[PDB]
Design a protein around this ligand. Structure first.
Ligand SMILES: Nc1nc(Nc2ccc(S(N)(=O)=O)cc2)nc(Oc2ccc3[nH]ccc3c2)n1
Length: 265
């Protein structure tokens, strides 16, 4: 529970779903009582979307009860007057999808494999704790350090749950959102994240391209209706795993233990 008076808002860094994102600085008493001014990532719920307040912070809170080296650190929340604000560690190099596009001509299968193994390790930990993320995607992978020593990533918070989001938002998040959740958002399950994990591998192999971006929301719907799969990326080293993960039968998608074994071979 951070004080409004200890937070300084600086540059806007874009927007998430019903949120506004800013780089900031938090003034804090740290260990040994030393005074720190710490770079922070601030996520602000739109006042115009206050109805979704509980769900977002419930999301960030539930995961913050679990500490893990591949899960992002949340410092707390500010009840900052009229706005609710998540205060999060500032990750030096930002979101993976932006990174993949700018650095495409420098990323090889060895780099992709380490990032995939790290993400699966995070997902395996969640799976062992029966905790559903619900929004696995390249935008929500944060790059802590660049390869020199491998790269190092963290999974960000999931944001507002698909189980309360407007249907048109869900449709635009095809193919991250699995077919059974389009049929019924209340079908959100552990198997949901295996599908989205497959979609995120496709992103990682596709230099930051967004699958099915050329398809409007009605065509995305008919894509699931006809049981299509994503095309193999030109770099197709992960295409079989992508397709095995994006299985239209939720009960057939592999455990992350099996996925990690597949990545290791
Ligand atoms: N923890 C964290 N740290 C950063 N750091 C950062 C941002 C921008 C730059 S840059 N290229 O301008 O120099 C550098 C570093 N950025 C984010 O962005 C996210 C990630 C996922 C998100 N899902 C919904 C909103 C959202 C926001 N999260």
């Amino acid at each position: 529970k951070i004080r409004n008076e200890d937070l300084i808002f600086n540059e806007s860094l874009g927007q998430g779903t019903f949120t506004k994102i800013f780089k900031g600085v938090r003034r804090e008493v740290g260990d040994y009582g030393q005074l720190h001014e710490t770079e922070v990532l601030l996520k602000v719920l739109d006042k115009a979307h206050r109805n979704y307040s509980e769900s977002f912070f419930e999301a960030a809170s539930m995961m913050s009860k679990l500490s893990h080296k591949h899960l992002v650190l949340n410092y707390g929340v500010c009840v900052c007057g009229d706005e609710n604000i998540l205060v999060q560690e500032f990750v030096k190099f930002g979101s993976l999808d932006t990174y993949l596009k700018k650095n495409k001509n420098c990323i090889n299968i060895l780099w992709k494999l380490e990032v995939a193994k790290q993400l699966a390790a995070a997902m395996h930990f969640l799976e062992e704790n029966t905790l559903i993320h619900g929004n696995v995607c390249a935008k929500n992978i944060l790059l802590i350090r660049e390869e020199d020593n491998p790269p190092f990533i963290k999974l960000s918070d999931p944001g507002i749950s698909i189980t309360v989001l407007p249907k048109d938002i869900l449709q635009e998040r095809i193919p991250w959102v699995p077919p059974e959740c389009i049929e019924n958002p209340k079908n959100l399950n552990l198997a949901t994240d295996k599908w989205s994990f497959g979609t995120t591998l496709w992103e990682i192999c596709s230099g930051g391209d967004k699958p099915l971006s050329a398809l409007d929301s009605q065509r995305k719907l008919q894509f699931y209706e006809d049981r299509h799969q994503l095309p193999a990326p030109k770099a197709a080293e992960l295409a079989n795993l992508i397709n095995n993960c994006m299985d239209y039968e939720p009960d057939h998608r592999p455990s992350f233990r099996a996925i990690i074994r597949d990545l290791n071979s």
